[model samples]
Target: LYFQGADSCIQFTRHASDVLLNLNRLRSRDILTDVVIVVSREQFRAHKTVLMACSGLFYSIFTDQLKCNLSVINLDPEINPEGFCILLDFMYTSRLNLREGNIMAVMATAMYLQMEHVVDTCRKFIKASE
Candidate 1:
């Protein structure tokens, strides 16, 4: 009996990034997609687990006591599809791709989703915007 189970185990710092990256790549295709978010008549497929993992709002919607697993989630007509893309990118990549021209729309969408970090980042942009 040499070193035991704990000592033989290895850790991977890259696992986090690797997993997200692979999941993001999976986003490109619809093989493992479990849900579809419909905004402004446009649809974007997503992994339910990924959405719940990254978003409190999503977690609530998907995990609602009475709400069954919905295949197609129709969003408010107010939320712009473009802004949703930006928010979705942030959820998957941890990068809020904010632009001076598109900030407000994205902020509005973030507000509806109640994404604290996204709202905070949008507020931070106020000082930076000309």
Candidate 2:
């Protein structure tokens, strides 16, 4: 038997990773990508679908200048890269990779992006947890 009973147990479930995998697939191929999101001297190759999903700041910016098929972004120097790139990567997978002494720039970057989830996650965890 080639595991005949096991077949019924297989749901073939495509969960959250499917979403990220699909996006990352195209991202890996540089396929149909739209922009380069820049911040604090760091740049990330971007897809508009990914961009607008997490940040209204990006959605607001894009909606204003829907003038594309041409160009990149330059977030003014109200940002720092030390943890900004972590925030950028976090959106891709909806996961955070944190380190000790890392919260400062992360919260700053999260605030700048207006990422309430990240900010809330930041403070609630970092807050007084007696």
Candidate 3:
């Protein structure tokens, strides 16, 4: 797998510098270049399926409680809102932002996707509320 970046592509060496440099460059909105999205064929298929279910999944997340906003304070691992919105963005948007709605949606999506560990982790947080 030859890793290519905008400015240059060096033969991938085992060093943190390469990864940090790459991520820093991506986060630098000033460099308005096409952000590379590298995924295998299987990954693409799985991602498409997950994202296609976003609407239904969103409903499932809020089914438990529609009144409260699933914010950091509500769903923090320490708080245990017992739900998260992680895999939704990983599926639909190809990224994860630690936002409130996304956290709830992602955790619910993880449950829908059968990501048991993440679901359990969120449950723990939710239980922590009491």
Candidate 4:
């Protein structure tokens, strides 16, 4: 008998990575940014749906009964600008490369942002480094 599995195979996730690539380009080109996040003196332009999907912290703000100013989201004073930029890039690219001296800061910021996947990735990176 011929293998039936080949005909029934589904590949819905094959283009999932491309979604991020397109979104990253949109962000870089400032196409569909509905919200602005400020980390120190730096500003990051992003879409509310993307932020809401990736982070519970953002989800709350976007969906909360008490609305917030989407024009500006100022980050906490303790969050490192450099680390936050790396974390933001990870959110856009779904890629994480821990810097030699910046891992802890990035990990902490990811935890604060409630990014479970990023936290797990950072943990694995730490374990592998040691």
Candidate 5:
């Protein structure tokens, strides 16, 4: 995609055109914010640990929160470790491609990183694949 002018200019590529098409479909889908940032040892880190230790029904609760918390950064503690890793993975690679078991994890991770498009793609996959 072409980067538009700082003040005003016009140049377009096929990719840019495609992106414009995609942009038109943008609607009020829930968006998660930056959920991961090396905040504090006890605060953000503690939440990361809780996400790691999550199990069974607790995992389910975490899953629902994952969808919510993706757009809600304050609840990182409710995120599971897999979700954290998914975020970590996205940090490493500017792209996201995760499996179903790993969907929420990566989705949460995408949100934490403030990569809204990645989160949207992942969420679309989650819904379509279901």
Candidate 6:
């Protein structure tokens, strides 16, 4: 018999990135969407599992016994439609792509959502762009 241990150098990043890309494409095409987030009449389709995995606030909203049944969330008062979409994209891709004009909005929403990684990434991007 041959003995083997766990290998950490596996193509983990590639596989993970590929999955994110597939999910992004699916959401872009509006397929297999389970949740809708609306801001200023703009609707973004998302999966609850992905949202829960990415944000503590979402985890609470989707897992709490009293409010786990929600299918649509409206964030017009606090979140910008375009900024929320960028944040949602970050949640899926683990990557932040910020523009010079939208970094502030995205940072505000990321902080509000308690996604520290995205917050830090946005800050870094802002500083780099300056």
Scored by Cα lDDT, where does model 6 land? 0.80
Residues 67-92, model 6: lDDT tens digits: 67778877647687778888898877
Tens digit of per-residue lDDT, candidate 4, span 29-119: 9997988888888888898888878887888888876655556788897888888888778888877768779989998988888888888
Clashing pairs in 2: none
Better of 2 and 3 by lDDT: 2
- Model 5 segments beyond 4 Å from truth? 1-75
Provide the TM-score for each candidate, comma-separated.
Answer: 0.86, 0.76, 0.29, 0.82, 0.38, 0.79
> Candidate 2's residue-wise lDDT over 1-130, tens digit each?
1233455763435555787878877877888888987776777787876777787677667677454444688876777666777877787777887665778678877887778898888888778553
Off by over 4 Å in 2: 1-13, 65-70
List the candidate numbers ranked by lDDT, top first.
Answer: 1, 4, 6, 2, 5, 3
lDDT of each: 0.84, 0.74, 0.41, 0.82, 0.47, 0.80
Q: Per-residue lDDT tens digits of candidate 5, residues 52-123?
A: 332232234446754525422344555566665555433333344477788876666556545566778887
Best by TM-score: 1
Q: What is the alpha-carbon lDDT for the whole of candidate 1?
A: 0.84
Candidate 5, position 24, lDDT: 26
Which ranges in model 4 have alpha carbons more than 4 Å from their true place? 1-13, 128-130
**Worst lDDT window (10 residues) for model 6?**
1-10
Steric collisions counted per model: 0, 0, 14, 0, 7, 0
Best by lDDT: 1
Query: Clashing residue pairs in candidate 4, if any?
Result: none
Ranking the candidates on TM-score from highest down gives 1, 4, 6, 2, 5, 3
Clashes of 4: 0
